Amino acid sequence: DIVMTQTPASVEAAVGGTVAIKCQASQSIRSYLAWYQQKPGQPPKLLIYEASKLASGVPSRFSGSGSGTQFTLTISGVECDDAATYYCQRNYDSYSGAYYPNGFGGGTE
Amino acid sequence: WVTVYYGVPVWKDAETTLFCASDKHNVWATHACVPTDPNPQEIHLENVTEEFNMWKNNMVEQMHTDIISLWDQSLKPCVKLTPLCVTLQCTNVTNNITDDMRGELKNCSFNMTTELRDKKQKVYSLFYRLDVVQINNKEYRLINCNTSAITQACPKVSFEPIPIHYCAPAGFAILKCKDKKFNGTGPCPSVSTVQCTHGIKPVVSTQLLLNGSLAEEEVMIRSENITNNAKNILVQFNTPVQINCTRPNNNTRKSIRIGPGQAFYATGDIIGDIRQAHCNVSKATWNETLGKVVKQLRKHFGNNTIIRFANSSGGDLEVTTHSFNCGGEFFYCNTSGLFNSTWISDSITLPCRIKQIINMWQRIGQAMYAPPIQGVIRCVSNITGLILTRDSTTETFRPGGGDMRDNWRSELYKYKVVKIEPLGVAPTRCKR
Amino acid sequence: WVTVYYGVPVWKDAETTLFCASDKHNVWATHACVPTDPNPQEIHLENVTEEFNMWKNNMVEQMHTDIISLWDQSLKPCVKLTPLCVTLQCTNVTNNITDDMRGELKNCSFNMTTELRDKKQKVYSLFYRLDVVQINNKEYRLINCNTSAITQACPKVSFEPIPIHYCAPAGFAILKCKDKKFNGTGPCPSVSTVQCTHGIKPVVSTQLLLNGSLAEEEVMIRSENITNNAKNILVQFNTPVQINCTRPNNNTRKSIRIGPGQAFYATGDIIGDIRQAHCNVSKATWNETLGKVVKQLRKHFGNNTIIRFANSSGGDLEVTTHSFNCGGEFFYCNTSGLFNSTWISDSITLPCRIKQIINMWQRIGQAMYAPPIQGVIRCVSNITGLILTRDSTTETFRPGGGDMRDNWRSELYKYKVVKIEPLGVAPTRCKR
Amino acid sequence: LGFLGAAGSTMGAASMTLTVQARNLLSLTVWGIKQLQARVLAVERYLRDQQLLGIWGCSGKLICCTNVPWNSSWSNRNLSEIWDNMTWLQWDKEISNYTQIIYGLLEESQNQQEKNEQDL
Amino acid sequence: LGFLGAAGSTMGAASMTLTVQARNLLSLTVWGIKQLQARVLAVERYLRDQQLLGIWGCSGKLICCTNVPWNSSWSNRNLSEIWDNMTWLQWDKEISNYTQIIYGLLEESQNQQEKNEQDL
Amino acid sequence: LGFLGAAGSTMGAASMTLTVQARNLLSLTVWGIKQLQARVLAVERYLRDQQLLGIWGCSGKLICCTNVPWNSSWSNRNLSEIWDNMTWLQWDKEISNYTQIIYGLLEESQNQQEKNEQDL
Ligand SMILES: *[C@@H]1O[C@H](CO)[C@@H](O[C@@H]2O[C@H](CO)[C@@H](O[C@@H]3O[C@H](CO)[C@@H](O)[C@H](O[C@H]4O[C@H](CO)[C@@H](O)[C@H](O)[C@@H]4O)[C@@H]3O)[C@H](O)[C@H]2NC(C)=O)[C@H](O)[C@H]1NC(C)=O
Ligand SMILES: *[C@@H]1O[C@H](CO)[C@@H](O[C@@H]2O[C@H](CO)[C@@H](O[C@@H]3O[C@H](CO)[C@@H](O)[C@H](O[C@H]4O[C@H](CO)[C@@H](O)[C@H](O)[C@@H]4O)[C@@H]3O)[C@H](O)[C@H]2NC(C)=O)[C@H](O)[C@H]1NC(C)=O
Ligand SMILES: *[C@@H]1O[C@H](CO)[C@@H](O[C@@H]2O[C@H](CO)[C@@H](O)[C@H](O)[C@H]2NC(C)=O)[C@H](O)[C@H]1NC(C)=O
Ligand SMILES: *[C@@H]1O[C@H](CO)[C@@H](O[C@@H]2O[C@H](CO)[C@@H](O)[C@H](O)[C@H]2NC(C)=O)[C@H](O)[C@H]1NC(C)=O
Ligand SMILES: *[C@@H]1O[C@H](CO)[C@@H](O[C@@H]2O[C@H](CO)[C@@H](O)[C@H](O)[C@H]2NC(C)=O)[C@H](O)[C@H]1NC(C)=O
Ligand SMILES: *[C@@H]1O[C@H](CO)[C@@H](O[C@@H]2O[C@H](CO)[C@@H](O)[C@H](O)[C@H]2NC(C)=O)[C@H](O)[C@H]1NC(C)=O
Ligand SMILES: *[C@@H]1O[C@H](CO)[C@@H](O[C@@H]2O[C@H](CO)[C@@H](O)[C@H](O)[C@H]2NC(C)=O)[C@H](O)[C@H]1NC(C)=O
Ligand SMILES: *[C@@H]1O[C@H](CO)[C@@H](O[C@@H]2O[C@H](CO)[C@@H](O)[C@H](O)[C@H]2NC(C)=O)[C@H](O)[C@H]1NC(C)=O
Ligand SMILES: *[C@@H]1O[C@H](CO)[C@@H](O[C@@H]2O[C@H](CO)[C@@H](O)[C@H](O)[C@H]2NC(C)=O)[C@H](O)[C@H]1NC(C)=O
Ligand SMILES: *[C@@H]1O[C@H](CO)[C@@H](O)[C@H](O)[C@H]1NC(C)=O
Ligand SMILES: *[C@@H]1O[C@H](CO)[C@@H](O)[C@H](O)[C@H]1NC(C)=O
Ligand SMILES: *[C@@H]1O[C@H](CO)[C@@H](O)[C@H](O)[C@H]1NC(C)=O
Ligand SMILES: *[C@@H]1O[C@H](CO)[C@@H](O)[C@H](O)[C@H]1NC(C)=O
Ligand SMILES: *[C@@H]1O[C@H](CO)[C@@H](O)[C@H](O)[C@H]1NC(C)=O
Ligand SMILES: *[C@@H]1O[C@H](CO)[C@@H](O)[C@H](O)[C@H]1NC(C)=O
Ligand SMILES: *[C@@H]1O[C@H](CO)[C@@H](O)[C@H](O)[C@H]1NC(C)=O
Ligand SMILES: *[C@@H]1O[C@H](CO)[C@@H](O)[C@H](O)[C@H]1NC(C)=O
Ligand SMILES: *[C@@H]1O[C@H](CO)[C@@H](O)[C@H](O)[C@H]1NC(C)=O
Ligand SMILES: *[C@@H]1O[C@H](CO)[C@@H](O)[C@H](O)[C@H]1NC(C)=O
Ligand SMILES: *[C@@H]1O[C@H](CO)[C@@H](O)[C@H](O)[C@H]1NC(C)=O
Ligand SMILES: *[C@@H]1O[C@H](CO)[C@@H](O)[C@H](O)[C@H]1NC(C)=O
Ligand SMILES: *[C@@H]1O[C@H](CO)[C@@H](O)[C@H](O)[C@H]1NC(C)=O
Ligand SMILES: *[C@@H]1O[C@H](CO)[C@@H](O)[C@H](O)[C@H]1NC(C)=O
Ligand SMILES: *[C@@H]1O[C@H](CO)[C@@H](O)[C@H](O)[C@H]1NC(C)=O
Ligand SMILES: *[C@@H]1O[C@H](CO)[C@@H](O)[C@H](O)[C@H]1NC(C)=O
Ligand SMILES: *[C@@H]1O[C@H](CO)[C@@H](O)[C@H](O)[C@H]1NC(C)=O
Ligand SMILES: *[C@@H]1O[C@H](CO)[C@@H](O)[C@H](O)[C@H]1NC(C)=O
Ligand SMILES: *[C@@H]1O[C@H](CO)[C@@H](O)[C@H](O)[C@H]1NC(C)=O
Ligand SMILES: *[C@@H]1O[C@H](CO)[C@@H](O)[C@H](O)[C@H]1NC(C)=O
Ligand SMILES: *[C@@H]1O[C@H](CO)[C@@H](O)[C@H](O)[C@H]1NC(C)=O
Ligand SMILES: *[C@@H]1O[C@H](CO)[C@@H](O)[C@H](O)[C@H]1NC(C)=O
DSSP states (O other): OOOEEEOSTTOOOOTTSOEEEEEEESSOOTTOEEEEEEOTTSOOEEEEETTTEEOTTOOTTEEEEEETTEEEEEESSOOSOOOSEEEEEEOOOTTTOOOOOOOEEEEEO | OEEEEESOOOEEEOOOOOEEEOOOOOTTOGGGSBOOOSSOOOEEOTTOOOEEETTSOHHHHHHHHHHHHHHHHHTTTSOBOGGGOSOEEEEEOOTTBOGGGTTTEEEEEEEEEOSSTTOEEEEEEEEEGGGEEEOOOEEEEETTTTTOOEEEOOTTOOOSOOOEEEEOOTTEEEEEEOOTTOOSEEEOOOEEEESEEEEEOOOOBSSEEESOOOOOSSOEEEESOTTOTTSOEEEEEEEEEEEEEEOOSEEEEEEEEEETTEEEEEEEEEESOBOOOEEEEEHHHHHHHHHHHHHHHGGGTOTTOEEEOOOOOOSSHHHHSEEEEETTEEEEEOGGGTSOOEEOOOEEEEEEEEESEEOTTSSSSOEEEOOOOOBOOEEEEEEEEEEEEEOOOEEEEEOOOOOSSOSGGGTSTTEEEEEEOOEEEEEOSOOO | OEEEEESOOOEEEOOOOOEEEOOOOOTTOGGGSBOOOSSOOOEEOTTOOOEEETTSOHHHHHHHHHHHHHHHHHTTTSOBOGGGOSOEEEEEOOTTBOGGGTTTEEEEEEEEEOSSTTOEEEEEEEEEGGGEEEOOOEEEEETTTTTOOEEEOOTTOOOSOOOEEEEOOTTEEEEEEOOTTOOSEEEOOOEEEESEEEEEOOOOBSSEEESOOOOOSSOEEEESOTTOTTSOEEEEEEEEEEEEEEOOSEEEEEEEEEETTEEEEEEEEEESOBOOOEEEEEHHHHHHHHHHHHHHHGGGTOTTOEEEOOOOOOSSHHHHSEEEEETTEEEEEOGGGTSOOEEOOOEEEEEEEEESEEOTTSSSSOEEEOOOOOBOOEEEEEEEEEEEEEOOOEEEEEOOOOOSSOSGGGTSTTEEEEEEOOEEEEEOSOOO | OOTTTTTTSBTTGGGGGHHHHHHTSOOOOHHHHHHHHHHHHHHHHHHHHHHHHHHTTOTTOSEEEOOOOOOGGGOOOOHHHHHHSOBHHHHHHHTGGGHHHHHHHHHHHHHTTTGGGTTO | OOTTTTTTSBTTGGGGGHHHHHHTSOOOOHHHHHHHHHHHHHHHHHHHHHHHHHHTTOTTOSEEEOOOOOOGGGOOOOHHHHHHSOBHHHHHHHTGGGHHHHHHHHHHHHHTTTGGGTTO | OOTTTTTTSBTTGGGGGHHHHHHTSOOOOHHHHHHHHHHHHHHHHHHHHHHHHHHTTOTTOSSOOOOOOOOGGGOOOOHHHHHHSOBHHHHHHHTGGGHHHHHHHHHHHHHTTTGGGTTO
């Protein structure tokens, strides 16, 4: 039913360099992708919602875009507070018509 | 090279005639409707999109003319009250009343035809103030004497709503959209196919929408054009608000023969005290529900917009009050007790009036006389939504309403009728 | 040896039900008629002959019953004037008249029911002499009081003719004959096929045929039997003759309530002088046209036959005068001013009368009351033909007419309905 | 030529217009109710012709050949004369009174060949 | 998948559900008279589609192959693209304006092969 | 024998009267409106039976043979007994409750052979 694959596994960069993480889907989830940041020992922090909007409390270094079945999370520069894995969450159910946070793909640093 | 295929799963938008399915000679002739298909199968369509437009949906027009036609057919074989349009001699009902009912009921005497053509009788009955017009104790006429015919509704035909399902003929299909964020127009991806819709109750009301479907994901606000102040806004609640209405007076009824084989039902006397009709709404529920509507309504104006609900706009009762049809009575309730707040950053009692002469479709044509009902009426119902209209930091909304080809519009917004076209061709590598 | 073919181009004579196609709730319910096929294709049939008989053509019978049924349905949901059949007290209209109108209009007062059953009012109206019958100032009755019900035509339903096209159902076809010398019967070689005919205007008239089709090659004279003096002769002109008719008086109208929701339209007073209604025909055109008819008419009698048109035969107005329906008024014009010549080897004015109570189909049944029309009526129309009947060197012809299932007979003479029969067999030299 | 364009044409030549005629055979006020009568009639007539072709083993064809012999008593003419010097209207009149004979023979001859498939 | 279940599916894959859609195409008060209108309409539409298949020589088949060549001007695509990467709704839109061309070619091409049986 | 003349006859013998029954299946006052109901009903029933024969690949035949195997669990009888010592009314009762099984098998088995023509 729900296919979500995060592909650029195990990517890291030196402070001042940049990174990006991307996810693909077999079903369109246009403008309904959420991104999370999980630091060890913490619950995931919401970073980006509806593909490109930042959540309150999210630093300006975070951004991203996408549509359809292709989406990317980008970091404008590493500030040494990026010690987290990131996750892709689907916020649209194509069978029920509801828009709730069902299903994850992810695990990339 | 050319291969012809038959049974290809494609369609075009189309308009066809729909027929009903459903399930004691009630007003919509539901006994003449075909039986439903029990446990009908709904089929989800994967990888499709479709566009909908609830403001251009011809299913609304058919429901509109079906209900009117049925209303008129059902009232056709009923006694006419023409002989009743006489000079009435009336006095006030004062013997057992509260002050709020002073002047509301009148005691009218008149000279009416007996079954024999050459004899007359002196009879009297009670009437509600709104059905009686003063000519010059005092002389009166019924409100419709200089405008239309009055037909008494048949006492055996009930009016409570009965679900009616609309079914497509073979070759046609109905596409139902489940997108729970759908605003009434444009692409709506969660499409499934049914052959016949669920039942819709043909409830007729103004301002408040009673006994309809509920929203789920959020309160939905829909309009043809948000920025056009000439348009209505339909608000669909995701939770019901409960109301309780009462007569509350204990009425009696008597029959008067007015010709061979025909009789008029007159309001008789009243047992016990005479009190004003009224409706109660839970206060806390109304308070919370309205706040939800405002939060969502603001998304189309800004987070710095103040929302005020003011009061009813003014005019004839049919468009200023809450027209409520229940128990066989016609209520006209005062909603100013509900829409009285400004949003920045116990029970509510609504006094209500009763009429017996009803112009149901806001047209000049035959009027219906509602016969009296004995005993005491008690109604319980769900407010499922409401109609608002809109009038530099404050926006003003008012109950408005009164439009027909509305209300049902909030039930049929989910459906579109399409025509199946089984033939098509494509190239391949075969030959005969 | 036997081969079966399907789609073989053959047919048999047949009778089926025809439906119409056409193009504000007029008398023929044309809004209920299907849309026409724009630019329909006419297909000429080479190397065929067919026989026709316009006197046995069942398309006439269907047009006859369709028009009558529509007339009656359209007048059904209209106010009845039963309460108007009362003793009238009348005097003559004399204040502003010419001598030709003296005695034509009467001023009648009467006691009529108000919307209240127990009250009456004194009202008056004007009536034309032909609608009022003396009983013994003087007491009168309306002409239909001892014969039938009178129904007022609904003021919103117009009567001017609207072309109606007759269409065959699939499997049937209409054969149209173009032979311009066709006399109504027998072989007619120039045959073409259409699916639906051109429009025919449902004009109702006597003596003169108005707004029909024209002949081309010659004036056509057709009859079932030329030598049978009991039959009518239909003459079709190849050129129109223009006529101009007028009220000419400036009328007013007033409404009288006669019961709840119902009103009678009474003729009010008249503005300016009262003059006689009349029709004008161009004189030179009539003079030349009649001569053409005579030249052709003589071919069936001999070159030594004298043709006389005498005068109208006598009887009730419906069969002695020119019944003309125009502007919503019913005219009965004196045609003796036209048919006054003997043929051997400016404008014409025809005085005309007006009636309001009309027995449209020459039957005893419901009569129609034509409501008054305000202002002044002006009519322009084309005479496309006429009806003659025939009474030892001189033959006498008279306007005659009055028959129904006529008039339309001059438009439908060109068409026959046939049934297509696609299957047939023939021998050949194949086997399976 | 158009619908019935070949009606006056030679029977042989007219066989190429069979498509044209077949193509045009299938489709509470005064002008209202007549449309149910018009549509029901068109459908019933269409189906009766298809039913006969089905029974005779001619389903799906404008032209079908069968194994029923021609009995010369129905028309004592050769093939050159009817196919080249006659129209379909004329032919239909000439053998109209044998229609019911031919049809009975055509249907019996089909069932007789269905039983022969019992062996395959 | 059920009726129209394949509507969003690949054109090739969807050919195996042709049975499912074909199977569901055929069937004086307010709720009374509408049933004659509903039934007459369903019948006429069913029959018109069957009539065209009959005329083109496709009677009795969900899939029929004919000898009309494909004119690339109708759609300049290869077969891999339309059968594997397109749905039927999309295809129908792309060539909708040539429908009347294809149909005229299909019927003429059938009559042209009926005359060829004159020799058997 | 006439219409239904073979109703009490042996199933085998009765196969030769299939033509007779098929031939008779197809066609605002009190006695008026009932005729639209009578005609619409006759047409719909006729067409539904033809539709099923079309789908199963039996169009145009009174008798058609297919490749669906007989599952003996439907009726544990041999052929001699049903064809020689039973009538059609009796047979219809015996296997009436498997009708929907047979029909599903018959239609799937037709589409499975249409795809096999992709190679010709
Ligand atoms: C919204 O939905 C609710 C729930 O369905 C609906 O409330 C119900 O209305 C019906 C009809 O008014 C009530 O049924 C009546 O109950 C009384 C008390 O027992 C009976 O006496 C009544 O019987 C008389 O009337 C019948 C109809 O004319 C006659 O056939 C009979 O012989 C008697 O004369 C009748 O059974 C029902 O009790 C309520 N339900 C509740 C919980 O109150 C409400 O009306 C709907 N909203 C709108 C606007 O319609
Ligand atoms: C033979 O054909 C001619 C040409 O068509 C036809 O003459 C036309 O008749 C119509 C209808 O009587 C005339 O139309 C009227 O014109 C007047 C003047 O402008 C208008 O006031 C009229 O409007 C009123 O009436 C309408 C109908 O009831 C209402 O809908 C409207 O609201 C008004 O109350 C109306 O438009 C038309 O002008 C003439 N044409 C000519 C050239 O005179 C003639 O009647 C036909 N012969 C017969 C026997 O019918
Ligand atoms: C309406 O008026 C009638 C007539 O006056 C009242 O009926 C009378 O009531 C007295 C008792 O108070 C009886 O003695 C009379 O015999 C009754 N007359 C008739 C004709 O019935 C009636 O009570 C009044 N109704 C109301 C609500 O005030
Ligand atoms: C008012 O709203 C309530 C709540 O949705 C309705 O009660 C539900 O009715 C459905 C259908 O019978 C049941 O499946 C639910 O379980 C009921 N919910 C609860 C909480 O009891 C109630 O029927 C509505 N009233 C009217 C008149 O429509
Ligand atoms: C028909 O008769 C009535 C009644 O006599 C005439 O109406 C009167 O006209 C005079 C003026 O001449 C007024 O002073 C009266 O008040 C009118 N009476 C009413 C009841 O309206 C009417 O004019 C006559 N009509 C004709 C055509 O002669
Ligand atoms: C009276 O006859 C004239 C002459 O035939 C009609 O005028 C013709 O109308 C047709 C159709 O609109 C035009 O194609 C011709 O060009 C017109 N001819 C001329 C000379 O103008 C006229 O319409 C007829 N009047 C009525 C009421 O039918
Ligand atoms: C009407 O009949 C004439 C013969 O009288 C047909 O003319 C012949 O047409 C064929 C071609 O189809 C030619 O080979 C012949 O030479 C023509 N005959 C003559 C004498 O010239 C004519 O085709 C027929 N019309 C129709 C529509 O079939
Ligand atoms: C909706 O589209 C998806 C592709 O985006 C389809 O998924 C493919 O299904 C086929 C089998 O039919 C597999 O072989 C492919 O590997 C799948 N693709 C991917 C990316 O996983 C899906 O089947 C379509 N839905 C429908 C009903 O046809
Ligand atoms: C009714 O049943 C009888 C048997 O009880 C049938 O008679 C047999 O008919 C066949 C020919 O069809 C003969 O070969 C047998 O010898 C007959 N049996 C006997 C015992 O004589 C009879 O035909 C059946 N009726 C119908 C209409 O089928
Ligand atoms: C009846 O009601 C009128 C108001 O419409 C009031 O003026 C009058 O005084 C009342 N009569 C009695 C007896 O109360
Ligand atoms: C009935 O008619 C008489 C006539 O004399 C009148 O006095 C009386 O007031 C009328 N009664 C009623 C109730 O209208
Ligand atoms: C009489 O008609 C007027 C409108 O002209 C309306 O306002 C009034 O209420 C009517 N009265 C009655 C008794 O019909
Ligand atoms: C519904 O949403 C679409 C965007 O998906 C927007 O273009 C359209 O105007 C909205 N309709 C209304 C009535 O707000
Ligand atoms: C409404 O509430 C009041 C108390 O404020 C109570 O007396 C009355 O009976 C209630 N009415 C209804 C219909 O519930
Ligand atoms: C309506 O009446 C029921 C009892 O029948 C009561 O439980 C409910 O609270 C009342 N609702 C309101 C809004 O007063
Ligand atoms: C109830 O309404 C008042 C305004 O009269 C508002 O201040 C309050 O927040 C509302 N309560 C709820 C729960 O919405
Ligand atoms: C509320 O609306 C009613 C009906 O239009 C009106 O009579 C009343 O005066 C209004 N009240 C206020 C405070 O505006
Ligand atoms: C509603 O009640 C108010 C009093 O709070 C009153 O002024 C207003 O006129 C009433 N509305 C109607 C329509 O009677
Ligand atoms: C609206 O609220 C005010 C208090 O803010 C109160 O005085 C007024 O009576 C209320 N209006 C209605 C119709 O209840
Ligand atoms: C009305 O009063 C009568 C008196 O006999 C009583 O029997 C009946 O139950 C009362 N009805 C109600 C609803 O109170
Ligand atoms: C009224 O007309 C009659 C003819 O029907 C005539 O005898 C009488 O004298 C006329 N009366 C007047 C006042 O002109
Ligand atoms: C109306 O009735 C009275 C009864 O006295 C009679 O004198 C008068 O003449 C009548 N009027 C008319 C116009 O008929
Ligand atoms: C009365 O009937 C006779 C026929 O018996 C008729 O001549 C006369 O005109 C009729 N008068 C009225 C007013 O109906
Ligand atoms: C029409 O002409 C034919 C000759 O072609 C003739 O036999 C027939 O009698 C004529 N019909 C009439 C009514 O004159
Ligand atoms: C008829 O002609 C006369 C002149 O002789 C003229 O006065 C009159 O107005 C004309 N009438 C019409 C309807 O043209
Ligand atoms: C009819 O009136 C027109 C002007 O509208 C005029 O040109 C024409 O000559 C008149 N016809 C006759 C026969 O008087
Ligand atoms: C006009 O009629 C007279 C007879 O009154 C006739 O002598 C004359 O020839 C006719 N004129 C024309 C052009 O026909
Ligand atoms: C002409 O016919 C009318 C109507 O039949 C008649 O009244 C008149 O006397 C006749 N005139 C002549 C001169 O015959
Ligand atoms: C026609 O006018 C003449 C006078 O020329 C007259 O004698 C005749 O009676 C009138 N015809 C009719 C039907 O009134
Ligand atoms: C017929 O013509 C003569 C002259 O020959 C004339 O005296 C007579 O009045 C005319 N008749 C009519 C009705 O015009
Ligand atoms: C009739 O007279 C009125 C007088 O006010 C005038 O306005 C109108 O135009 C006149 N109508 C005609 C057709 O002369």
